[model samples]
Target: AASLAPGSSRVELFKRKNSTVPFEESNGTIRERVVHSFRIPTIVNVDGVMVAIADARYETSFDNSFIETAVKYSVDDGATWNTQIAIKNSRASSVSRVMDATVIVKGNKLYILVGSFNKTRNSWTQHRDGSDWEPLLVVGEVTKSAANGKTTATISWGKPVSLKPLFPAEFDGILTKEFVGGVGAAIVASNGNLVYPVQIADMGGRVFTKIMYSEDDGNTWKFAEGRSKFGCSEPAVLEWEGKLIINNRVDGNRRLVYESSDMGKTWVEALGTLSHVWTNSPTSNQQDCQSSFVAVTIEGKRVMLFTHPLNLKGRWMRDRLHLWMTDNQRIFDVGQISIGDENSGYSSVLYKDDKLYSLHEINTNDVYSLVFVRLIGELQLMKSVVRTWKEEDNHLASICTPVVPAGCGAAVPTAGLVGFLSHSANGSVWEDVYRCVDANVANAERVPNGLKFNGVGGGAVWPVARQGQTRRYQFANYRFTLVATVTIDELPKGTSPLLGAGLEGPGDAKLLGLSYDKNRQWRPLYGAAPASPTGSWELHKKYHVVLTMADRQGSVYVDGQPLAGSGNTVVRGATLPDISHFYIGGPRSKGAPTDSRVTVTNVVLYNRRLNSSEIRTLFLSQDMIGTD
Candidate 1:
């Protein structure tokens, strides 16, 4: 009773006023409501006129009432629909029977299905009035007469399809080719080829798929050749991407996917696919694939629709079909299938009048028809971009100098630091000074998360948090002008970087020529080191780091040339503060609650650090450099 899905509410998009073409209206009273009429249905597509399947009607008459034999035609797309009619009716000469209608469209040709009843010539004495007979279904096309609804006779497609038997050696059979009698599924390839696959078997009632084709406009026929067939009966065919796949069930073990390149002439081996069971079945005794009705649905995506025996190994057994999908036709991922429970009834498979329909029983047999869907609406995007910068917490402070500082060359580690600018540091103010790295924090961070202050009370500070695997935070605060020369060294024992730096946190502490504790003494960061064996401390590349509270924005100069620095360097109206506690090389045990040990040596600091002129007077003594 449901009219449409909840989402398809836009009625205006498909509201076109056209003449309602009456196909046929049957209450199915003509023959127990099952016989179908062999009539062609037409519909309009974007390109031009196209033929499709319509509601199947019965070909049975009263008195001798039999359901067989029917007429077919094609107006715009057919073999000879414009000339004389091809076959008057199907090859049926019986009295009490029924005939099913079939229609297939490939390229510009229309295939009309007409079935025949083969009966024996002998009769019985007081026995049945007629001979034992069986049914065979065939499909072909005709040309149009170019007149008002007239057709001509021609051979566009010939159809009495076949394939090798799945049980010829297993159960022994009469030398008769299994005919296209059972309900079938067919789809035309994108390359204008036909694939009408049928599942037929009388040997022990085993089921196998047989395919029919029309390469050169349905002139001749080629019986399919394959070793095994999907054990189940119903056959639904579809071509996705490139390959053609036919699906059916092999009993309940697994529904099979059969591959064929040619139009069903010979198929590849049956691949046992579709393995999971649904509806809470006992894991140990799950049921196999259902061999009942199936529809190879081609919705927005292409998928297979079939009747499944719910919990075959558990407790579900009724008339119900399941839906499944495969985009690549390789892996059967059934996530996007639209499923219908047993609550939606069952009927025969038919494709007519540009519409594919399944007769499902709701209250009565309601036809669940298929419709093509288009897309509409608005969607927003989600995105972003990022850049890189330097961190303040692990910075390298340098000062250029003309002469070495007097007393102990030392400076507070926390002096020149501007807080909030670094991600690693939380404090941006000069209030309560931060504690150096501790054992508890180090151990918690799995890595060598530690720091040290060295020099004397020139103790050496490892500043493990600031010591990177690559060059330590030297680029962070590399100012030109004044240099802070400090020495850092290493000992052998307990040398596991973290351990050695910890125990020696206050041992090698030295600032200029003096020593002091981290909380009391101040020390220059590093001393001058030569690129040569000549211990020319002045001619060596050295750096003296000092932490002043002054917001001096002055630039450094070499040989009277300003290397880099501005005279307006100041943070608001702040002044350079004097250094107190020593944070020499890195960090150390400031108080009893101290930091780890690191080493340092030959420390020195330059007040009014050397300009490029003073520095060059000794090393690389060049007068002019980097001239544009």
Candidate 2:
């Protein structure tokens, strides 16, 4: 019911500097603090009380020596947490580490279901071939206390219960049977069943994610099959729209998704390419990591918020935790807010009262420390801020085309106008525009009523897949005209993206882009190379630029004057299927690290090629408006 803060898409991050430390280790001299082996943080709320737990270790090596279940309590909305206490402390000689902690809060109790394996064999490789077996359900009863001016709660750990029967014994139905990493997190169904995300693996290394649900508290369990051959593991589950939307860590460098309408009875891949949101940020080098998906309500609508190492540059290098959010339970590329640009990974998120609390582990010089991050203010308000922009801006299209008429640059050809992105953060040019993800919105300038591309980050919209290509718009090999009105303030330091389409296949995939030639000339890039840099433009001034690739070759024209090779050999049959995917100012996929300082406007596409005179006339049409 309250308004959002400025830059509503922003994430405010805080490291619980004085929270608590549950475990530690020493190699004879100074002890090292290691928070987790896989760092599956599980946060849950029961009766307004918050509990945080994790898979914790004391050291950073294979011989971590001790891995146990660690817990922390926060009753004053996570302002300060109680000292972390090992619930079922594993002996240092046990060679054990709890892998995943999925917590469920019921009435006055909290339950943690974990599956683990130990470092028994001297080689530290016994669990890889499916010989690991440890299923523990550690239950705790909540008790409040106020001792000596301190407000804290004491959690008493009950007898540890093991779910051995649920293991299926022979490991035939086991997902990742030899691996001890338990399900990332568990969700309590609306029907009182505790659901845990589990993985099944074959000897050939093929892995599948499955769900095990317990109806009678932690007494019994049943398995639900996830889509086999999807090759996903370490799943995190959430219930939305009366269905289960599961998130999985897959080998493809992109996170995978599964949905089940029948209450974890069966699972199938969710719809649309939107489902496979990655664990890393768009610019992040590494993409594979386990993440947590937590659901919250924004003005009565369900929205999902997740966290992972936004920068996983090297293998499992947890660096810079980022929180990504989505309201539709689908598309997640709308916004990414950084939690902490640190060596952190695998997280658990909890939204209680009016705030959000995240528990994660940070690596400092190979030492790990668990942190509690309290996100003050309403997160849904942030979601609502982004959700408000969903009212599509059609004005971008109207202002560009304005009217329709018959002629060379007639009312913007709808026939072959495959892609149309404009100055406004307007939607894409074609119906396939929905396929475009992560388009830069907050950066491009609106100066002088024109879209000024600073290229600081990314200022273009492009397609996600080849499905956006195809017959959506018919393409003729020899008849195409690309026009843009731009002012070159300064050229790029190196090669940067300008307007045009890109082909994904073999030889010279550079379909169409502006060449900021290293030779210091602004030229037109038709295929791979550009037409000779006969002449260039001035700084801080406007010019009408056109690239017409007709029967002969391609020609580059500026302000009614045709440059050399306006009739050169423009290579046609690169077999460019359809000029389906096009971009402006930058590539469709990622942004350039180098920004091209320029202002672009009147970007129009055409199906039929314009003649030299017609090209000159069109340049005047846009240029004359400047004088008017």
Candidate 3:
């Protein structure tokens, strides 16, 4: 039997007040206090043994507080962990606190890099107030022995050495301030050079992410020539396909990625790549935080795995922990590992001998707990999902044309389409009618070839900006077209909205919509005002309507013909609102369901506006019973 009972395959590695250690504060007061928190977790596999490292804070959880680096090892594949040993402890001073430890493993030798800062001054305060921080390096050698069917692994550590002086003279101005190694495992490049992600702040208070590489192992280290743009920090580096890639944290609630071929001598921004791990909406809780990136070989093909908090609700809500797999080209989200209301921060992953493990932080209130979990199920599921992605990509590549013409052989155009919903329903729910994206219908009854809404609450909603689900689709200044086949079974008592591009927050304001009134008149709604009523709409008649927005103007086409008030100047010299949802049948703000019966079918959306010929072709292809 194992000594620790694993719950959900997770073992608590470190917890608040779980272990007490003697620590001396700045005032030379030595006392054995409970560890205040644990953070900046990093894990690595060295010679079949898993080692995890973190900072055991003795004071507040702030970055500049009193902290020490500790390490733990697991010989039974993370089923159990040995007692933690303080690898680097402070010596009763503000400048002696070591934090943010990251490790690199090379042939049973582990190199640990940490940041030691003056407790009273650090980048957390956004200024340089005390002596510059130091970058410390510690090397360890691992030895394993087996006796009586029991295996034991132990590591011997070397003294910490400051690498601040090793920086080039040209970087003196920048190195005069704080410099620290980022959290997580650094990579040994393909060319046998050791590279670590480090952040440097200039005297002007601007921070940049750069690499510190050692050509001759741990003997000497040098900084990279070029660094990332200012305001980027806490980077994770990995070597993929003969190039070194660094993903950095930015204040814009997103990540900035750069790749270098000459071991960080020069870098180029890798745009349109890693889109899944790049950015979330600025208003969401997907803020920039330290993430773990590592590459592993699976089935003779190399792939990368990333771990981070995948929440997107409130500010700093690091609640949802997720894993993502990518092949340096396309990304597939493996799924959530854990979720909570408290903080989940700074994860590190280790893959060894077909087993995957993650050591991460989970907080209750403000106290932190370092947790280790074997991702056996997640790893299996990731392989399956990657297989599906490859199959889908290959099949689509074989049959999919680059350009799809409108109304071509009953196939929906795929050129700029972002959403498509039709008559695929399962009982009362319609599960992602398009199959390519999520445009689910809720609280609607299934019809033969459409969905019928009985003036009830729910409708089909495509969350265009929901984080972690779909890519953000910008329709402000960009062009977009919406086509829907709708039939008004009867006139409503009040104004009834049919289609809408809804704003995010609480309001009835839609960027664009089409409504029909009780007076049998068609209304075009834009922004906060309603345009003049266009042609009349008869009851019990089917109509194919198209709405296009281009150059801040809105146009309406009914049955392949332009409406009376088409091409209206909807918005003028104003920044368009952020559209969060594309609504069918009604807006979300409508309390009283419109007193009308409507059947909506074939709702297709495009990121680009369709031409008149395309619009006519689409309308002709729709199955219309009778046109008004």
Candidate 4:
């Protein structure tokens, strides 16, 4: 049963078939044998003691007779372990299979919660999922005690508690008799709410994650209001910026994200697909495996650490595990650490005292064991910085008196310019600028210290690739901030572009044009105008305009000041595309006499998205002269 993929190597082909390798028996016959399968590991730290929990069968024979939950405690990190304990279903007449175990560390105290179903309580006819009477819940705590110079953890337990139904009285009744607890730990919120993620299969046999919280520690645990969609199970929660962010494991590709503002009372989708907000390298892979999401403030910055399998093609785990670090802002991929080489399983990550630690399942042909990896010096940072530009800056040759000699076709300088094409022909007034110069000119001259392009008789500065040249003028696909000083002398007849690009003509294009309506008002667009306006581009009087687009939305500023109300400066409904051409003033056609005449001074482009305050600061730094 080797993979038939076209480019698969001989080793990979052998690995596929070796998953169930055959063995030679003494009777000269061949039989298939498998290693003992150990699975579902959880790790926690109480005081300085590290505990590893997992389920496994005793022998190589894949049978459930010895399938039990076990725990090992390590005092000197996880290099050595001594305390070993086997836990059984407290309500079962005999040792039944252990379902799930959740460990939460609160200071030096440890809470080990176990949830399972007893086989003896099953109905005689049997059930597909489970019967309501079979479920059981038990809570245990480990506390430190010192009789002399040495300290030991003294364990205590509460009486067995009957587990409630899957859903509260509010939702549909008695759905599933079985439930699972934290593959990840509980988050103690700033408001003192103990929040843990729980999972249960629905009547349709699909698993979903829901929230359960305890305000007064273990005294009471209440089910939260809602659950995530099917396949979203075993979530990890983190508190950052006064909000709780939950990352869930799904049965599909791309992880799911939910944000809770009112302390887990409700959840909202921050992004349908998480990689869109926080990008990952292996973009195509999926997540049917559990992942860990935790945040810690390091070096005065909130560093969010995430650990998951890096299998870009597999949908259900089995790949190298990687630890990704982010600054908890716009940029997520600040760095990554390789945790496993191949076929690693589920992981839970935690950050404490300037160091990061992860406990995850490692396997060869079968589950080997979980390891406590202390990454004190293993992570590296990916450098992304803020780039600033100032006014009167002599960019591209065109804006510096004479346009670049080779027009837009010349090789651009490496200092952050894709291309700069300015229309600054000498004595070329705003009225007849188009007919004055063609693409053969470095012949253009500066007017009023900037370039002027007339909407009449149609010619514009374009950055489109040549017939034999490689096209590399890519613009915003998701986010960008563009700053330019412009003066509009007239509005086009009806609607037209002031500056833009990306088009084979009408039917296909994704251009970001400074568009104007008959009212002389200006707005930005991809191809068509968005529904609203960012106020008017008044005639005469030079004004610096800064237009930025992110999340498929646009924001406009004139003279460094936003439009009248907070709502007037935004327009939406389209997104930018990979621009092959960049144009300034009028359309790139020969028949654009109806468009407005304009003067453009310095232009600046940022590769990454800028925040609102940064945009305002950029405008205010323009000597505050552009403010209305």
Cα distance off (Å), candidate 4, residue 367: 3.6
Name the candidate, 2 or 4, with the larger TM-score value: 4
Better of 3 and 4 by lDDT: 3
Please write out the lDDT profile of model 1 over residues 143-211, one tens digit for every residue.
Answer: 434445653333344544322322233322323333442233345567766655554554333456666
Q: Where in model 3 is the C-alpha error above 4 Å?
A: 1-7, 20-34, 59-62, 84-86, 89-95, 118-132, 169-176, 241-243, 275-288, 297-302, 310-317, 326-335, 397-437, 441-463, 466-628
lDDT of 3 by residue, 266-349 (tens): 998764355224553334324567788899987556889887665555345566777777775445566677644456777888
Worst 10 residues of 4 by lDDT: 383-392
Location of the lowest summed lDDT over 10 successive residues in candidate 1: 378-387
Each model's TM-score?
A: 0.36, 0.59, 0.65, 0.61
Candidate with top TM-score is 3
lDDT ranking, high to low? 3, 2, 4, 1
Tens-place lDDT digits, model 4, residues 194-284:
7777776655556767777788976777887766767666777778779878777655444667887776677876531232232122543
What's the number of clashes in each of the models? 120, 11, 0, 5
Model 1: CA > 4 A from native:
1-4, 7-95, 98-102, 114-177, 181-185, 190-192, 240-242, 249-253, 261-323, 329-628
Q: Please, what are the lDDT tens digits per residue for candidate 2 over residues 433-525?
A: 222232334246664324666645545544433332111122323356777787766656665555666665554365445655444566666
Report how far residue 34 has shifted in candidate 1, in Å. Answer: 12
Q: Candidate 4: misplaced stretches above 4 Å?
A: 1-37, 59-66, 90-95, 117-129, 132-138, 145-160, 165-177, 272-287, 334-336, 339-341, 379-508, 511-523, 526-545, 548-555, 561-617, 622-628
Q: What lDDT does the true structure give each of the candidates? A: 0.30, 0.56, 0.70, 0.51
| Candidate topping lDDT | 3
